[PDB]
Design a protein around this ligand. Structure first.
Ligand SMILES: N[C@@H](CCC1CCCC1)P(=O)(O)O
Ligand SMILES: [Co+2]
Ligand SMILES: [Co+2]
Ligand SMILES: [K+]
Length: 304
């Protein structure tokens, strides 16, 4: 394997962290390949759950809890902290909230969150590497409570970063918020990518294509599939009671991605930097509720 940039995995990984048996698990948690019966059962489906009011309530609770766990992680972003240390903290913080860390053994993903540094687009596996001043780092959190999943991420600055870092991060967030702003009943899922790319390209950035936003509720990933790039073939129309994410990944250089031999880590083929943000959204009559929004601040962490 020829790595695309300067980052290398830092093994070995600390042994898998156990989840106390009292925590409710999703179906894949103890599958040996981390497969989810329920997700496969709807694989290739185009139909989109209309959540009931109790659904909506479970979704509100788990997304607020996931936000709380992300905020715990944000509080540890500093030079010299390892992504593995971040994950240990996240893992305890899920357990303390009585939630299962959704990423754990999801298709054998071996950690409880993703930490994606610099040229890692997404799904980085927490490891022994200490964070370096100048890095950017995304932490992606997903929790499971009472049959429901809630998913969010943000990109963070590690001490001081270069203007290009600042520009990529702010721009990515602006991409996400401009997309959310278009969310309301009657809007086509494919329109979101047009809005995202339009802003990305205007700032001299490219848009990752192999990874999409997705529906989420009782399933971790399900319809709709939501591409972040222009002129895409996404199927379906927003309707009050839909829940899904938008999570653009935006790049310095080219858009092309490839995967590390670990089977998970997605990096720029060109070794240049990528940033992402994610929210879990519910479509309401007037627009949408940002179920994973920060409550103690109007803004994401990087700009506070
Ligand atoms: N939370 C992230 C993916 C889910 C995890 C990636 C590694 C294991 C699951 P997302 O659905 O945003 O890509
Ligand atoms: Co997601
Ligand atoms: Co996520
Ligand atoms: K690399």
């Amino acid at each position: 394997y020829r790595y695309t940039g300067k980052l290398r995995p830092h093994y070995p990984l600390m042994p898998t962290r156990p989840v106390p048996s009292y925590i409710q698990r999703p179906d894949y948690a103890d599958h040996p390949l981390g497969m989810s019966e329920s997700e496969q059962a709807l694989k290739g489906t185009s139909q989109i759950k209309l959540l009931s009011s109790e659904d909506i309530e479970g979704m509100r609770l788990v997304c607020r809890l996931a936000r709380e766990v992300l905020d715990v992680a944000a509080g540890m972003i500093k030079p010299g902290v390892t992504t593995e240390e971040i994950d240990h903290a996240v893992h305890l913080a899920c357990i303390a909230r009585n939630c299962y860390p959704s990423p754990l053994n999801y298709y054998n993903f071996p950690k409880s969150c993703c930490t994606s540094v610099n040229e890692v687009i997404c799904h980085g596996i927490p490891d022994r590497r200490p964070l370096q001043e100048g890095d950017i780092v995304n932490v992606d959190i997903t929790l499971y409570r009472n049959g429901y999943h809630g998913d969010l991420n943000e990109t963070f600055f590690v001490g001081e970063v270069d203007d290009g870092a600042r520009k990529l991060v702010q721009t990515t967030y602006e991409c996400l918020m401009q997309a959310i702003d278009a969310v309301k009943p009657g809007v086509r899922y494919r329109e979101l990518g047009n809005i995202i790319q339009k802003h990305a390209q205007a700032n001299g950035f490219s848009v990752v294509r192999s990874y999409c936003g997705h529906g989420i509720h009782k399933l971790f990933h399900t319809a709709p599939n939501v591409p972040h790039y222009a002129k895409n073939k996404a199927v379906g129309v927003m309707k009050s009671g839909h829940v899904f994410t938008i999570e653009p990944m935006i790049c310095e250089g080219g858009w092309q991605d490839e995967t590390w031999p670990d089977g998970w880590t997605a990096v720029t083929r060109d070794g240049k930097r990528s940033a992402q943000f994610e929210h879990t959204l519910l479509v309401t009559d007037t627009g949408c509720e940002i179920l994973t929004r920060r409550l103690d601040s109007a803004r994401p962490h990087f700009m506070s």
